[PDB]
C-alpha cells in the first residue's frame, strides 16, 4: 500500500507541561495513505504546522494497487 512520510510540529497552546513533550512536539512518522487524511486534519486542528509530506511507498497516481 502507498505510505506517507510526514514531518510536523505541534505547539501546546492550552497548557504548559512539565514532562518532556519534544517527541509530541516534533515528529517524523510513516502514515498509511488512507490514515494520512485524518492525521493531516488532526495536526491542523491541534494548530500544528506540517513541515513536509512525502510519499514513502507506492507510485504516483498508479491506476490500480
Amino acid at each position: 500500500s502507498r505510505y506517507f512520510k510526514v514531518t510536523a510540529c505541534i505547539p501546546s497552546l492550552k497548557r504548559v507541561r512539565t514532562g518532556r513533550e519534544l517527541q509530541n512536539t516534533f515528529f517524523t512518522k510513516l502514515v498509511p495513505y488512507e490514515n494520512w487524511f485524518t492525521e493531516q486534519q488532526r495536526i491542523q486542528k491541534a494548530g500544528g504546522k506540517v513541515l513536509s509530506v512525502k510519499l514513502f511507498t507506492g507510485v504516483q497516481g498508479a491506476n490500480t494497487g
Binding site: 518532556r20 490514515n35 485524518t38
Partner: protein, 144 residues
C-alpha cells in the same frame, strides 16, 4: 495517581538518537523503556502476552527505530489477524463491539448512540471499519 492504573508513555525514540560517542556501546540502555512499552501494549490490547508465533515483530521493529509512533503501533495490533480471531470472529456482533471498545478506548460504551454508530459501521465495512472508527475517534486522540 496511585488510585489509578499505571500509564505508559514513550518519552524518547532511541533509533534517531544515534549515540554521538561509543557507537558500539553494547550496554546501550533505554532499550527497556521501549521493550516494556511493547509488553504493555500486548497487555492492554490482548490482555495477555501472545504465544511465540503470534506476536507481530514488524510493527515492533518500526516502533523501536522510531519509524512509527505509539499511535500507529496500537493501530497495527487492532488491525491484526490474531486480534480478529480472538475477539471478532467468535462472538455476536454487538458483544464483539463492546469488548473491542473496552480494549481500545479503555471504557465501556456510555450509550446506545455510540453502540449504534459502531454497529452501523460494522455492517458496511466489517471488522476493519469498526476498529478504524474507534482509533480515528477524536475521543481517542484527546486522551491518548
Amino acid at each position: 495517581t496511585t488510585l489509578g492504573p499505571k500509564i505508559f508513555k514513550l518519552t524518547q525514540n532511541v533509533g534517531f538518537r544515534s549515540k554521538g560517542m561509543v557507537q558500539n556501546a553494547g550496554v546501550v540502555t533505554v532499550e527497556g523503556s521501549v521493550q516494556a512499552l511493547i509488553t504493555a501494549a500486548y497487555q492492554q490490547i490482548f490482555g495477555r502476552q501472545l504465544y511465540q508465533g503470534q506476536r507481530l515483530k514488524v510493527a515492533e521493529i518500526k516502533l523501536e527505530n522510531g519509524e512509527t509512533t505509539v499511535k500507529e503501533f496500537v493501530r497495527a495490533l487492532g488491525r491484526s489477524e490474531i486480534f480478529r480471531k480472538l475477539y471478532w470472529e467468535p462472538f455476536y456482533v454487538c458483544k464483539a463491539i463492546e469488548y473491542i471498545h473496552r480494549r481500545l478506548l479503555g471504557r465501556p460504551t456510555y450509550d446506545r448512540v455510540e453502540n449504534n454508530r459502531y454497529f452501523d459501521i460494522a455492517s458496511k465495512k466489517g471488522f476493519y471499519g469498526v476498529v478504524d472508527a474507534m482509533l480515528n475517534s477524536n475521543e481517542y486522540q484527546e486522551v491518548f
